Amino acid sequence: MRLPDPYTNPEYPGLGFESVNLVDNDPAQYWGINISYPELFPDEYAFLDSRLLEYKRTGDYLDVLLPQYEAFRVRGDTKSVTIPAGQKGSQIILNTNGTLTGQPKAGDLFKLSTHPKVYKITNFSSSGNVWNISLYPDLFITTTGSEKPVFNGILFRTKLMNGDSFLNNNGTYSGISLSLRESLE
Ligand SMILES: [Cl-]
Ligand SMILES: [Cl-]
Ligand SMILES: [Tb+3]
Ligand SMILES: [Tb+3]
Ligand SMILES: [Tb+3]
What we know:
Blueprint: E1 19-25, E2 30-36, H1 42-58, E3 62-65, E4 91-95, E5 109-112, E6 119-127, E7 130-136, E8 149-150, E9 155-160, E10 177-182
Antiparallel strand pairs: 1-2, 2-10, 3-9, 4-7, 5-6, 5-8, 6-7, 9-10
One terbium(III) ion is lined by residues 18, 38.
């Protein structure tokens, strides 16, 4: 399920992260997401708490958007992009077919349309419609040829770690925080 935020629930602006830091865990590699919320009104707190209760009762995952990485540097319909099959390692080659505008930058997020792993772009070079995107970590799969690139709206597939650890009498709740980790399976 989707972690509620001001984009799924604009009526709860307090669900916008006040601080987020992306943690690199290398024992395979996975991202840690530490979220700290601003002062939450009671309705916002109860809705967040009830959604996390739903998450626990369903055994589902928590999909998380980090808007601080949504730069929309690459635009266009990606379903006509071609990712040749058989690729693995730290670089992925795409053929844009001239259907994408703008270019990605090192530090942007990246994922494949068929797999939930999120990567960081570490380097970008191009030759015409050939894009050479270096990734971190290495690809978790070998491309089949049907994958499509995802630059915008990237969701992290996570699980909640500290389900209990962390009333400011403005009526609100202060110091609320969530510890999340990208889940392997
Ligand atoms: Cl091609
Ligand atoms: Cl190249
Ligand atoms: Tb703020
Ligand atoms: Tb503040
Ligand atoms: Tb391998």
